[PDB]
Amino acid sequence: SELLVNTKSGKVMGTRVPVLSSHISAFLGIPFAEPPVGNMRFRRPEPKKPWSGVWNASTYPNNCQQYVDEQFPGFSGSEMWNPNREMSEDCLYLNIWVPSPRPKSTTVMVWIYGGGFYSGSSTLDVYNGKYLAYTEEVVLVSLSYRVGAFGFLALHGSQEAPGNVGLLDQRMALQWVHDNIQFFGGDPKTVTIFGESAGGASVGMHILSPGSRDLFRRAILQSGSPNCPWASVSVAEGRRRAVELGRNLNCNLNSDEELIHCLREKKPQELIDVEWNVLPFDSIFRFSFVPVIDGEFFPTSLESMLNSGNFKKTQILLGVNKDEGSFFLLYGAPGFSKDSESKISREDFMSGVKLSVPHANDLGLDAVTLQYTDWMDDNNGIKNRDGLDDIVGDHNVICPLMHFVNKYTKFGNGTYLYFFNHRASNLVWPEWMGVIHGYEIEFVFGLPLVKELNYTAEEEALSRRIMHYWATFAKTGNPNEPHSQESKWPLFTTKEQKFIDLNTEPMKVHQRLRVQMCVFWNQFLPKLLNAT
Amino acid sequence: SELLVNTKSGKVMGTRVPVLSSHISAFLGIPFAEPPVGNMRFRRPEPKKPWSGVWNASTYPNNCQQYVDEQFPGFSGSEMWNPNREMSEDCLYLNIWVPSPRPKSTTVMVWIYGGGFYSGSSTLDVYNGKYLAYTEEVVLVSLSYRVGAFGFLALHGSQEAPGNVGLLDQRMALQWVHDNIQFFGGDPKTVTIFGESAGGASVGMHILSPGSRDLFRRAILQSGSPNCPWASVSVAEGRRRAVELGRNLNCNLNSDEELIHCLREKKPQELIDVEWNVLPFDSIFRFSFVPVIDGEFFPTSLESMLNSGNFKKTQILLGVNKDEGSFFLLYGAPGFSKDSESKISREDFMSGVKLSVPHANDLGLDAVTLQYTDWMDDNNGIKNRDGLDDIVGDHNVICPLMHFVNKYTKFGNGTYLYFFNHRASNLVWPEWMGVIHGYEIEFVFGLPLVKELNYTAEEEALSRRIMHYWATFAKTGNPNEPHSQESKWPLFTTKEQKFIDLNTEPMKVHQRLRVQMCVFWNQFLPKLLNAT
Ligand SMILES: *[C@@H]1O[C@H](CO)[C@@H](O[C@@H]2O[C@H](CO)[C@@H](O)[C@H](O)[C@H]2NC(C)=O)[C@H](O)[C@H]1NC(C)=O
Ligand SMILES: *[C@@H]1O[C@H](CO[C@@H]2O[C@@H](C)[C@@H](O)[C@@H](O)[C@@H]2O)[C@@H](O)[C@H](O)[C@H]1NC(C)=O
Ligand SMILES: *[P@](C)(=O)O[C@H](C)C(C)(C)C
Numbered sequence A, B: 001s002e003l004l005v006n007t008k009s010g011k012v013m014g015t016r017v018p019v020l021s022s023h024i025s026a027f028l029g030i031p032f033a034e035p036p037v038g039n040m041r042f043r044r045p046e047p048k049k050p051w052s053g054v055w056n057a058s059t060y061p062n063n064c065q066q067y068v069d070e071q072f073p074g075f076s077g078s079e080m081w082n083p084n085r086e087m088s089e090d091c092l093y094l095n096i097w098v099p100s101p102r103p104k105s106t107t108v109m110v111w112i113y114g115g116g117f118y119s120g121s122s123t124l125d126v127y128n129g130k131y132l133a134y135t136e137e138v139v140l141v142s143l144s145y146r147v148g149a150f151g152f153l154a155l156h157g158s159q160e161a162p163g164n165v166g167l168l169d170q171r172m173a174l175q176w177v178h179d180n181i182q183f184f185g186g187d188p189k190t191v192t193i194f195g196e197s198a199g200g201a202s203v204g205m206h207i208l209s210p211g212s213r214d215l216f217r218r219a220i221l222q223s224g225s226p227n228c229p230w231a232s233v234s235v236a237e238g239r240r241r242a243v244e245l246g247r248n249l250n251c252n253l254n255s256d257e258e259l260i261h262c263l264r265e266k267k268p269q270e271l272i273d274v275e276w277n278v279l280p281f282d283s284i285f286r287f288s289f290v291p292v293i294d295g296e297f298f299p300t301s302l303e304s305m306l307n308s309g310n311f312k313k314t315q316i317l318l319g320v321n322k323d324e325g326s327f328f329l330l331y332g333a334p335g336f337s338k339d340s341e342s343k344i345s346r347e348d349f350m351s352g353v354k355l356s357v358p359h360a361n362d363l364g365l366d367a368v369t370l371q372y373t374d375w376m377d378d379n380n381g382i383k384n385r386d387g388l389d390d391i392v393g394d395h396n397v398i399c400p401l402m403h404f405v406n407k408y409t410k411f412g413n414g415t416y417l418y419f420f421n422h423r424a425s426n427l428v429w430p431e432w433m434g435v436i437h438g439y440e441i442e443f444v445f446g447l448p449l450v451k452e453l454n455y456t457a458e459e460e461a462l463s464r465r466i467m468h469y470w471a472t473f474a475k476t477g478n479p480n481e482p483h484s485q486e487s488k489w490p491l492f493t494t495k496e497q498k499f500i501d502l503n504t505e506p507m508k509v510h511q512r513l514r515v516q517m518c519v520f521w522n523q524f525l526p527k528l529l530n531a532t
């Protein structure tokens, strides 16, 4: 039986799923760790104990416990990111889509969801692996990992809540893929990890962490990089926020043991309800429980690792969307709303700048304002709105990614950079938001191939082009088909810094992505802040 | 006799001078102060004692003792600025051009030469007042004043070398004009002071100083403003440089009395030979002996005077040239030379930035570099050369002037702003230097009306247009002829910030002159430097 697979953990039975007038096999909700429940809350994951009989892998698993977005009830633009299954702390499962007939030793791609480390689900419609697995003939895996305090509460020095456990959940799923994917017809020596936003940061973190490097071959990072300002905190800051969470829940704070015990007694929703209260600043694009620079998962600072070439040397493919900032401004900044053009007054610009760079002193804020204000036309509401989008996008996504790409490329074995700038014809969000954080994912996963979803012909073609770049890259370390006539995606090099756009128009090659602003964010501002 | 005038100081006999197929009267070398020689060196000027008989005013006076430019011997571009008469400490004289027949009560314009406070002469060919006096029917006066240490050595607290004596020379010439110009047919109630570079700064300083305000009606400032970073120093810095001059000349430094006595024994050239050695920094566009913020000539800081409206409220006309920086880069910065295109390497750019902003710390230098580097094309030699021109021009001339105009306009009675951007057809300097510091002067003084000087027809027309703006402004407080059909030079207002270009093409109105860079120079950089 094509739907029966024996693994080192036991037998699993999958399900035949229709896809684009054909079918493939899906193995959904396979456990890769023991349920991290009770006294196991906050602890490193434990390998799943093997089972007897046949694991029923016909249905999606529970999602991890998380904050749920209720800002626009019933609206598909926001609800498409929310858990679509029951939430449980029992949530460490993976999903595999397998071509039919079962392959022998094919390329494997492992998806790591984003959600700012506070949310996310492997089960979202937009992460349905069937289209990519079917079209490009890969074994497509999606893993899961604990988010929020359950994944990232960090009391450094404690073994009960050491931090980074969600990253260790991801590593354990990669370990399981390494050990077992061959039985599904996957080649464990040709595994590509790929992820978006926090999943992109996570991919970079596995590139860096000595304990993860050997578990995959190559990597794709979408709108995320390990050095993003929101993606990690120090052990002191992690400790502070954990104690502040305890304070919110009226915990005994006299020791780590007392705090952890109190926190373990709470219902999951109790933690989630006060999660946002522990942030040190009035901010946007900052999240409470995130990876911690611990000296173990990350042996030294991210900057010193990148500078010294202390990371996995392989090929990477990565890039960003045109309007990375707009999502967070909409949700978090005055003057921005879903149902208006959100033209921004000078005053709301200033408020926005302060929220966007919460760690800056007044001089730093002046620097940012000067860098992004057109002083020939400073009361232009469109320019102010677009300026803020750029500030938030450049600071949180594009410039950290550019800093990563330039550091990585000095030691790596091949870099391909993209700029995704296609606004989908059927987008439900307002026009002012442009090409939003997260909205390339639907193209990467082939949703535009589905008739009922109402994409244009050109959008289907774009999706096929992207799926083929991603999968060819996963296969070979190069997104370009050898000896094809199509226009080539050039290698990013330190010298020429080339990248391509990704849209429905003929591909163009560009150079030096947002270089002017990234010198400001990567070189000048940090120096200014360190001096003053 | 038209050439004989009786004044309160005694009788003067002038000379009939040919001008443009006609003639006018010139009274050259009239004394307005006692010779500031011997024990009077460094002291405030004394009014000239009246004389018996007839003062022979047929020939140009001596020029004040100054550093003489020998960088390009025999080259007209540089030598046109050098003294063209014998140098003497006996140099406090003025020149008057008077229409023929002698007017009754006509508009008076008083020219104050530039030269960075270290040089300058009233007698330069380029300051020949005959063309303007003849064409526009004004009484044209040019004054003189002590420059270098002779005018500006400052030992605050001493009455023997108090500082600012060159500004007091200028005021005494204005006093003489006030008291005597009526006899030459001038109206002492309608005197316009005008000057370029240090003369423009000087004009602004008379606007500010309570002791000067009553001596003139209105004012024109060309490429200079009183708040320019090179135009004044503190009393502490003036003292330091005076003592350092003494050190260079092996003076007794035990007291002001000992230092001044030593300095008074020296031949003028002895002072001049070591003048440049007292500067505190490795710099360009900085001069050794300049006006001092003394609490007397200037009652408080220039910034507090400007902020509180502590200045003469009247009409002003002022502006700048396109390439204010190039002169000083040519003379003072590596990579720049007279006979090459002076394309600038990244390395010479950095050296240039450091020389241009000598008071900045390393962070400030980084700020300037970031503000003026095109990071998409950073090795472009033309862009680097042009970037440096802008840095030097914006920092030293344009941005201080813009700061002055905006402060002044809040309290004043009418502001007219220009941007002179015509490159003269017969310019002897290289093309890379563009529209140079000082090169509007020839247009203001009507040299393009002289056939033998080889200007184009369009340049003559531009000169006539400029002379007419300047003189109509001097007459009425408005450069525009009432009820003429020509296009109007609009008033500069706080709200609309309009200015005109001045070139051979039809006049255009623009707004917000170099506003982006001037926020950097006037607001951000000073804040950065004060914090770090
Ligand atoms: C990626 O690594 C491979 C293998 O280390 C590089 O290929 C080698 O390149 C050197 C220098 O040209 C050759 O002498 C070897 O013969 C190559 N080996 C093989 C197996 O081809 C390759 O250049 C690297 N690619 C990038 C883009 O850095
Ligand atoms: C495997 O599971 C299939 C779908 O199961 C459904 O979800 C689980 C969690 C239960 O709630 C179950 O009642 C639901 O039907 C079944 O259709 C299928 O029969 C199962 N196969 C075997 C061999 O057990
Ligand atoms: P990143 C901040 O993890 O973003 C998530 C995936 C999204 C829902 C797209 C905003």
Ligand SMILES: *[P@](C)(=O)O[C@H](C)C(C)(C)C
Binding pocket: B081, B113, B114, B115, B116, B117, B196, B197, B198, B199, B327, B437, B438
């Ligand atoms: P400013 C620095 O006084 O400039 C003088 C007049 C010139 C000779 C034009 C450079």
Ligand SMILES: [Cl-]
Binding pocket: A431, A432, A433, A434
């Ligand atoms: Cl947009």
Ligand SMILES: [Cl-]
Binding pocket: B431, B432, B433, B434
């Ligand atoms: Cl030029």
